[PDB]
Amino acid sequence: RIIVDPTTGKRYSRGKTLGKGGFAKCYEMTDLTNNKVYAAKIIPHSRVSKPHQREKIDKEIELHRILHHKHVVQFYHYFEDKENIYILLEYCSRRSMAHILKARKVLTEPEVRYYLRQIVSGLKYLHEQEILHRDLKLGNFFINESMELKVGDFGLAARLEPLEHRRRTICGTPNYLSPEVLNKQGHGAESDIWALGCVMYTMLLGRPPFETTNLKETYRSIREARYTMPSSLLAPAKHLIASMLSKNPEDRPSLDDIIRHDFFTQGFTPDRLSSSCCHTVPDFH
Ligand SMILES: CC[C@@H]1C(=O)N(C)c2cncnc2N1C1CCCC1
Secondary structure, eight states: OEEEOOTEEEEEEEEEEEETTTTTEEEEEETTTTTTEEEEEEEEEEGSSHHHHHHHHHHHHHHHOOOOOBBBEEEEEEOOOSSEEEEEEOTTTTHHHHHHHHHSSSHHHHHHHHHHHHHHHHHHHHTTTTEEEOOOGGGGEETTTOOOOOOOOTTTTTOOOOOOOOOOOSSOOSSOOOHHHTTOOOOOOHHHHHHHHHHHHHHHHSSSSSOOOOOGGHHHHHHTOOOOOTTTTTTHHHHHHHTTTOSSGGGGGOOOHHHSSSSHTOOOOOOSSOGGGGGOOOOOO
8 A cells, every 4th residue: 555645745655564552553664765664653543533642642753753872763754644643663573572571481691681781772862862761661672683672662751850840640551660650759760760670670580570550459569669589580680670679769770880780791791682582592601
């Protein structure tokens, strides 16, 4: 199917479906003017009929479009016709880390380092743009043909605010809600670091440190930041996790601290992972 941008000319060719993404049906989409393929979100206007959800995609577009970094999903272009909103993004042929961990259950430490360094790289970039991601999770770590990680899904992203004028209600339904968010202090950069500690824990253990049902029954355990630290963890992994999941947001490490922690500097890390790592445990050393 040929899709024309009524604003510019510009013709696109719709390829195979990639599946559902919230408000969107997702497709391969080729810009016929470079002949390059992008991952497209196609959202019918009927899915954004309410002003609040109209405002939701608009902000996603506004924030995402200004980002350029090797470990952030590259926004290409967006347009609309009478039927749909089209958001064309960097095509990542090897799905996400959610798909990888589902298959692998648990990852090796050099792999955890490989992926985490890339997540930290992209999040660093965001935090310096004073943009908070607000839903860091394995499904939002997209993996391209070359096994490179890109942080995506800016659905819940917002510009940083000072505490005094900050939103205090839980925004959307993120994977890892953060003691300070549950204490109605709002979501800061440390809340992204929370979610990064939960990610690392999940990569190593195959399950989150706290329940992720977002039910009010789980709030106390999260606020208290009490969890099982399994003995299977190596000591440096244990220490870095512990620091990222500090109860008090002020006690958590900076991003520069995180990648300079012993967990990273005292282990081997590949420059490149093979795609077999999506399915199979890699060889030693
Ligand atoms: C287009 C949405 C999401 C995505 O954001 N990117 C960048 C992506 C990039 N490459 C492949 N798929 C991607 N997806 C998938 C499509 C179905 C569910 C999520």
